[PDB]
Design an enzyme around this catalytic site. Sequence first.
Site, PDB file in Angstrom:
ATOM      1  N   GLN A 187     -52.037 -79.575-114.812  1.00 46.67           N
ATOM      2  CA  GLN A 187     -52.317 -78.517-115.779  1.00 46.67           C
ATOM      3  C   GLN A 187     -52.066 -77.143-115.173  1.00 46.67           C
ATOM      4  OE1 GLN A 187     -56.328 -76.933-118.165  1.00 46.67           O
ATOM      5  NE2 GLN A 187     -55.487 -78.991-118.470  1.00 46.67           N
TER       6      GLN A 187
ATOM      7  N   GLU B 234     -50.708 -86.184-118.530  1.00 50.56           N
ATOM      8  CA  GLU B 234     -51.251 -86.040-119.869  1.00 50.56           C
ATOM      9  C   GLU B 234     -50.364 -85.106-120.683  1.00 50.56           C
ATOM     10  OE1 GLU B 234     -54.401 -83.431-119.809  1.00 50.56           O
ATOM     11  OE2 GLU B 234     -54.754 -83.409-121.979  1.00 50.56           O
TER      12      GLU B 234
ATOM     13  N   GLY C  30     -57.189 -80.430-109.254  1.00 50.69           N
ATOM     14  CA  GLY C  30     -56.723 -81.404-110.220  1.00 50.69           C
ATOM     15  C   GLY C  30     -56.410 -82.743-109.579  1.00 50.69           C
ATOM     16  N   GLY C  31     -56.690 -83.815-110.327  1.00 47.92           N
ATOM     17  CA  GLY C  31     -56.323 -85.143-109.859  1.00 47.92           C
ATOM     18  C   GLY C  31     -54.821 -85.337-109.784  1.00 47.92           C
TER      19      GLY C  31
ATOM     20  N   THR D 200     -65.009 -76.774-113.986  1.00 44.75           N
ATOM     21  CA  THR D 200     -66.137 -77.620-114.351  1.00 44.75           C
ATOM     22  C   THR D 200     -66.178 -78.908-113.537  1.00 44.75           C
ATOM     23  OG1 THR D 200     -64.795 -78.423-116.213  1.00 44.75           O
ATOM     24  CG2 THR D 200     -66.426 -76.709-116.675  1.00 44.75           C
TER      25      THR D 200
ATOM     26  N   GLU E  14     -63.629 -81.348-106.703  1.00 50.69           N
ATOM     27  CA  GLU E  14     -62.438 -80.653-106.217  1.00 50.69           C
ATOM     28  C   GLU E  14     -62.412 -80.484-104.702  1.00 50.69           C
ATOM     29  OE1 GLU E  14     -62.795 -77.480-109.358  1.00 50.69           O
ATOM     30  OE2 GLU E  14     -60.595 -77.622-109.220  1.00 50.69           O
TER      31      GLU E  14
ATOM     32  N   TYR F 161     -57.377 -68.363-118.753  1.00 52.26           N
ATOM     33  CA  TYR F 161     -56.263 -68.817-117.927  1.00 52.26           C
ATOM     34  C   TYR F 161     -55.011 -67.994-118.187  1.00 52.26           C
ATOM     35  CZ  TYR F 161     -58.633 -72.893-115.968  1.00 52.26           C
ATOM     36  OH  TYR F 161     -59.479 -73.714-115.255  1.00 52.26           O
TER      37      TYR F 161
ATOM     38  N   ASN G 274     -52.984 -66.362-115.186  1.00 56.58           N
ATOM     39  CA  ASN G 274     -51.605 -66.731-114.879  1.00 56.58           C
ATOM     40  C   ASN G 274     -50.677 -65.528-114.965  1.00 56.58           C
ATOM     41  OD1 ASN G 274     -52.451 -69.435-114.634  1.00 56.58           O
ATOM     42  ND2 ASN G 274     -52.195 -69.743-116.845  1.00 56.58           N
TER      43      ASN G 274
ATOM     44  N   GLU H  43     -35.918 -68.475 -94.619  1.00 54.20           N
ATOM     45  CA  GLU H  43     -36.493 -67.261 -94.052  1.00 54.20           C
ATOM     46  C   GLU H  43     -38.015 -67.272 -94.108  1.00 54.20           C
ATOM     47  OE1 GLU H  43     -35.519 -63.566 -95.823  1.00 54.20           O
ATOM     48  OE2 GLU H  43     -34.409 -62.782 -94.093  1.00 54.20           O
TER      49      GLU H  43
HETATM   50  N1  GTP Z   1     -55.185 -70.200-112.002  1.00 55.61           N
HETATM   51  C1  GTP Z   1     -55.219 -71.260-112.798  1.00 55.61           C
HETATM   52  N2  GTP Z   1     -55.986 -72.346-112.439  1.00 55.61           N
HETATM   53  C2  GTP Z   1     -56.030 -73.439-113.242  1.00 55.61           C
HETATM   54  C3  GTP Z   1     -55.307 -73.469-114.426  1.00 55.61           C
HETATM   55  N3  GTP Z   1     -55.536 -74.664-115.012  1.00 55.61           N
HETATM   56  C4  GTP Z   1     -56.376 -75.385-114.236  1.00 55.61           C
HETATM   57  N4  GTP Z   1     -56.702 -74.633-113.143  1.00 55.61           N
HETATM   58  C5  GTP Z   1     -57.571 -75.038-112.028  1.00 55.61           C
HETATM   59  O1  GTP Z   1     -57.244 -76.368-111.690  1.00 55.61           O
HETATM   60  C6  GTP Z   1     -58.392 -77.096-111.328  1.00 55.61           C
HETATM   61  C7  GTP Z   1     -58.352 -78.465-111.999  1.00 55.61           C
HETATM   62  O2  GTP Z   1     -57.073 -79.054-111.885  1.00 55.61           O
HETATM   63  P1  GTP Z   1     -56.112 -79.275-113.164  1.00 55.61           P
HETATM   64  O3  GTP Z   1     -54.736 -78.718-112.902  1.00 55.61           O
HETATM   65  O4  GTP Z   1     -56.707 -78.661-114.409  1.00 55.61           O
HETATM   66  O5  GTP Z   1     -56.042 -80.874-113.350  1.00 55.61           O
HETATM   67  P2  GTP Z   1     -54.624 -81.634-113.415  1.00 55.61           P
HETATM   68  O6  GTP Z   1     -53.686 -81.067-112.378  1.00 55.61           O
HETATM   69  O7  GTP Z   1     -54.050 -81.539-114.813  1.00 55.61           O
HETATM   70  O8  GTP Z   1     -54.957 -83.169-113.051  1.00 55.61           O
HETATM   71  P3  GTP Z   1     -55.848 -84.091-114.027  1.00 55.61           P
HETATM   72  O9  GTP Z   1     -57.255 -84.201-113.485  1.00 55.61           O
HETATM   73  O10 GTP Z   1     -55.224 -85.463-114.087  1.00 55.61           O
HETATM   74  O11 GTP Z   1     -55.856 -83.462-115.402  1.00 55.61           O
HETATM   75  C8  GTP Z   1     -59.594 -76.290-111.785  1.00 55.61           C
HETATM   76  O12 GTP Z   1     -60.386 -75.958-110.668  1.00 55.61           O
HETATM   77  C9  GTP Z   1     -59.041 -75.024-112.404  1.00 55.61           C
HETATM   78  O13 GTP Z   1     -59.694 -73.899-111.858  1.00 55.61           O
HETATM   79  C10 GTP Z   1     -54.533 -72.373-114.791  1.00 55.61           C
HETATM   80  O14 GTP Z   1     -53.887 -72.385-115.836  1.00 55.61           O
HETATM   81  N5  GTP Z   1     -54.492 -71.267-113.970  1.00 55.61           N
HETATM   82 MG    MG Z   2     -54.718 -82.672-117.422  1.00 56.80          MG
END
Ligand code: GTP
Ligand code: MG
Lengths: 346, 436, 54, 425
Positions: free
Chosen positions: B11, B71, B143-144, B179, B183, B224, B228, B252
């Site tokens: 994500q 997803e 994220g997982g 949430t 992590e 977000y 971003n 570099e």
């Molecule tokens: N800066 C920033 N952080 C994000 C964003 N989306 C999620 N995060 C961070 O990513 C962490 C969770 O990982 P995710 O990327 O949402 O999960 P994922 O990579 O989709 O993996 P899954 O668990 O399978 O959904 C959280 O601690 C969020 O703070 C974003 O759009 N911008």
């Molecule tokens: Mg996801």
Amino acid sequence: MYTFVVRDENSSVYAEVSRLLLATGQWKRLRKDNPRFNLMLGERNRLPFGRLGHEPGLVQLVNYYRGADKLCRKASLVKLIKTSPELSESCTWFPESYVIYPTNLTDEREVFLAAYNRRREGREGNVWIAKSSAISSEASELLDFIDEQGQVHVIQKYLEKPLLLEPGHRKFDIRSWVLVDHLYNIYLYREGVLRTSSEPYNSANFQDKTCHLTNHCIQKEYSKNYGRYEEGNEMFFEEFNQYLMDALNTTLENSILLQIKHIIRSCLMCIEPAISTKHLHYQSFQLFGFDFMVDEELKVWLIEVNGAPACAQKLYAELCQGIVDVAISSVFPLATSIFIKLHHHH
Amino acid sequence: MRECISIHVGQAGVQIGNACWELYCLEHGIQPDGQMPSDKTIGGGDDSFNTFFSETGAGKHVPRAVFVDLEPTVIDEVRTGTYRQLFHPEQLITGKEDAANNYARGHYTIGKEIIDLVLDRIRKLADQCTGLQGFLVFHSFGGGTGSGFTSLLMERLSVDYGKKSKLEFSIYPAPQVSTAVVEPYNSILTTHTTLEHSDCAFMVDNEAIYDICRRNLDIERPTYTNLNRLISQIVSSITASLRFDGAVDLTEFQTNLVPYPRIHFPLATYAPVISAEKAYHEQLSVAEITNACFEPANQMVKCDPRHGKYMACCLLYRGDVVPKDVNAAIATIKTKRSIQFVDWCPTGFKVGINYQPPTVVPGGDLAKVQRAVCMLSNTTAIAEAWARLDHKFDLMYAKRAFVHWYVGEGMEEGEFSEAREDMAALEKDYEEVGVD
Amino acid sequence: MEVIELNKCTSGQSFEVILKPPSDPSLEEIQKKLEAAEERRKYQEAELLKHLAE
Amino acid sequence: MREIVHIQAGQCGNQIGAKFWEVISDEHGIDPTGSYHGDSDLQLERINVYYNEATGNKYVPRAILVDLEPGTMDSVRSGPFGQIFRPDNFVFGQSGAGNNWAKGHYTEGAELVDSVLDVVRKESESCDCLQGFQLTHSLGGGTGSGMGTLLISKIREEYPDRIMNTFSVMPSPKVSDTVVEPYNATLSVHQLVENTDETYCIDNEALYDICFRTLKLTTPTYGDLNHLVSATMSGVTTCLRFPGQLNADLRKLAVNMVPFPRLHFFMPGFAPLTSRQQYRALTVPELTQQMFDSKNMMAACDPRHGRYLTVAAIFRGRMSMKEVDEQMLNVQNKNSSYFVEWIPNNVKTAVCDIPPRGLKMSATFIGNSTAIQELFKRISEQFTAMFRRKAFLHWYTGEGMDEMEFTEAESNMNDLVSEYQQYQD
Ligand SMILES: Nc1nc2c(ncn2[C@@H]2O[C@H](COP(=O)(O)OP(=O)(O)OP(=O)(O)O)[C@@H](O)[C@H]2O)c(=O)[nH]1
Ligand SMILES: [Mg+2]
Ligand SMILES: Nc1ncnc2c1ncn2[C@@H]1O[C@H](COP(=O)(O)OP(=O)(O)CP(=O)(O)O)[C@@H](O)[C@H]1O
Ligand SMILES: Nc1nc2c(ncn2[C@@H]2O[C@H](COP(=O)(O)OP(=O)(O)O)[C@@H](O)[C@H]2O)c(=O)[nH]1
Ligand SMILES: c1coc(CNc2nc3ccccc3[nH]2)c1
Ligand SMILES: [Ca+2]
Ligand SMILES: [Ca+2]
Ligand SMILES: [Ca+2]
Ligand SMILES: [Mg+2]
Ligand SMILES: [Mg+2]
């Protein structure tokens, strides 16, 4: 309801601060591993500064400035004075000192001998002293004593003309307590202490170090006149001020305090851009123990700075309450200052 | 000309990538449909922007990027968003159920099944590169999929592309916007299996970006989007030298910023971040924006560089900046700041000036500035970020909390202590180089 | 305070200022790690079904 | 498309499930006949999670109604939203369970289970990507207790990697049907420890006390109690039924709430709870104090008697998200002793813009606390008081069970208690 933790059970100063904070009924103590605290009374060594200021919605304050060890370590202070332009190697209130590493380990051995040989040739007094955070007029004895150890040492000019109190003909040192708050205001505790010697100073026998070292533990162990002139070999600014008037016809403010206030300012202002918690995600405050020497010309010398000092038994209450007032309460407000603010430019 | 492939995973990586490539188009003047009037060489060319965009016979400029997410809800947005016409379907890969914040689930359970497909799509882009340089992998530590699948994808990339460089843009997990409670586990699991495979990684602590948004942009509760739009500015400034004619190649970055391999985590600093809602602001001078590079309040990771030692420092200026003013501010700052370099490295600065000032997203939150500078510095004070996480990791692992969810996916409990022993060594490595 | 390698062009320029001088696993193995994990998943799910048939 | 299959077994299960579908149907703008009539698209953003789409833009709840006697399910079919349910999803017998766990689990129920699973499989076969299942039922009866746990066991066998959460009504001595409820609850709990990912413990005594002491209801009714269970069931699912930055599936939620496999029992909470001064606007602080107050929790357990493993707060309404963050951060520091310090940032908050019907803003509380052991101690105490003397055992041994299986269910729940005890220190 503010929360705090305690990570140094041996601190006599902050054992009373925690006692006072709880007495306010508005502070609550947590376990020493709970991270939801407004304040931390942390450990002396390896305090985890990197973990502070990262709790959302919690203004966090610690009772140690990160980087002050440059000022409180014997070998670190010497390096800070000679290398800092604000102080210069020509600093007039700090004894000529050198950092010597034991030969079993830069080092100022050759620079020390050069200044040592210069004195020996000029018929000048050449009694130095070796010490370390862990007395002799001969260079061979001082350098050999350091080789027999395994930590950094410092050789600095022993003050051979110290101001002697009467009756007794004895040496002494002055302990001033300085509190620095988060805004970096420099408050000098109006109350000082003189840790005096109960033995007549003897310039022809540095072997017996009981008349040369004014430490409170050495006097209460190896001195045979402990408590003769003043209780616990501790004289306070009121009596010492009266003695100066009767004997020398001056005051403590003019004769000594003015120089002390200047020395305190000069050291803390020198490292301000390096430890200031102005734009930091946490806030710091620290209580400092400055140790001074006073020669027979009423010049004040700097000995060392203690980063975790204890206090005189009689001054624990007043000083600790002032810490809470200006250091802790100033950041966490509850529901005539005993300090002398040392104004300066930030 | 040498190409660069971007890989967005999870994500966080996808949404950040969406914000980056938006900025890239506005910077290179590419419209949402993929056209570029300023490009006179139709259907081909080896220009400074072609390192990131390919050209079709119809004149469409297509990003050299791939989006991966177990997803489909996050990548569906890109398929119907403003810039849908930029990408083609092969470039967007999605599963049907995510990794549920479980590193093992992304690395072992789901990754295994989708790993060979992603590599094949990447190969399709590689088959379009006349001299491929490497990859820019955007992902999240928490994220997982971002932590779990990224580590697997890296291992396979070092196999199918041995000599190619790889750079990470990693999102450090912050509680104010997360949430998830595990992590720390994922972060330490992914930095372990990914270390030997990444050549330079820029960490962005969401905690930093958050306070930068509330403080400089007066956003009470940032989204977000707000996070971003900012990160892409920092990413743009870091990648600008690959898309424009200024100094140049991915090699570099390691050579200039990573002397010791494991210590490949530079610290980023960007300024000025000014609120567009502000009526008008005093245009900060080069000295001022350069002096801002040493306030922690402008760092992508909160830490104190005064109590570490530096190994390198680049100053990437964009806008009205001339060398005379840079050196003026530099000498001014040296006599005021605490900057300790290691004895085995020189005490200097590499500086690059790009005359085109930073581009801002219309209706966005960032005000147009006349000169902006992003500093990249390899400080040992960034080791604070590892200490913070490694502590949380230790707090839970002591009670084995949440470990069963991982073992439930086939991972062995030893990989925890193994990964932790690696982070204990990485913390030792920093202390050896930075402390006396 | 030495400026060096001053590089200029129409879109910008680059230079260097110095203040003081100085003083993998194979595809075979990866497939095994992945399959070994899938094998521990099979054995844990087997033990679950065995306990369920009982 | 992350579909959720709903199941309701037994008298209590079906009645509670019924009111639940009544509650979310209104929130999603679905009337009693299956047509949509809302004014916002958020109502249809995630409608497929709990609803199937039929011909003519009809939405049919993906709910399978199960019971051994027909009594209750005839009520639902003639209920307010009755006609909304798929006529095939009514699976019921005629013998009844006689409020006997053995009958629902081994004898009378055994004869009906295969037909229920046939329906579950039919619903699953049409789920683009099934999230998991949810079961409503009581633990003091026989059908939802005895057969519900039997269903759960058979569902985990066919769908071993799908999430299985339940809303389970604990029997209390204050609101009691039969004296054998301690036997049934203990036998059910052992099953729930093994085969459920999330079990929301709902103590009837708590619902009663809330309806009596707080809501000022002189004579509460099973209908009054169920209204609370509708609002709570609707609350803990808002993150699933509506769009928000939260996202999350059943599995992502469990991973973050369940640090140890068999400690997955939650005490839910709702707020406000106001007696008919019922129109007064509620500030963000007032929602929070009550939410963390024990009187607003439905497990009859004093949180101050244990420590929270994890905590999740879901807010609904047009409120200041900044001010929301502020108040949550305030409660934890006020009562730090009741949160474990070895799970960093174990208090999470979500915000939604759609409030429940008639409320400007509400707060749903989900609590994984070690205080929930007191609920199990009460059950285990009543259980042993009977089992030491083998009182009423013949009703179970007659159905084919042995004293040994009772001694096992006893020990298994006393171990569960010790487990909760070690982590409280
Ligand atoms: N800066 C920033 N952080 C994000 C964003 N989306 C999620 N995060 C961070 O990513 C962490 C969770 O990982 P995710 O990327 O949402 O999960 P994922 O990579 O989709 O993996 P899954 O668990 O399978 O959904 C959280 O601690 C969020 O703070 C974003 O759009 N911008
Ligand atoms: Mg996801
Ligand atoms: N150059 C010098 N000339 C004269 N006396 C000196 C001296 N250096 C040290 N001393 C004596 O040593 C004593 C202080 O020693 P020092 O402070 O280095 O050790 P220490 O740190 O364990 C004591 P404290 O920390 O309490 O000040 C003083 O009382 C002083 O009289
Ligand atoms: N809250 C609530 N509890 C109920 C309801 N109906 C039954 N119960 C509880 O469930 C237990 C009896 O279970 P029951 O539903 O009769 O068992 P069944 O044979 O499976 O239907 C008793 O302890 C009741 O307190 C209801 O409508 N609401
Ligand atoms: C059907 C079965 O479970 C549900 C709701 N589960 C749920 N877990 C959660 C974890 C954290 C916050 C809200 C949560 N909500 C609906
Ligand atoms: Ca071209
Ligand atoms: Ca490589
Ligand atoms: Ca029969
Ligand atoms: Mg000392
Ligand atoms: Mg009945």
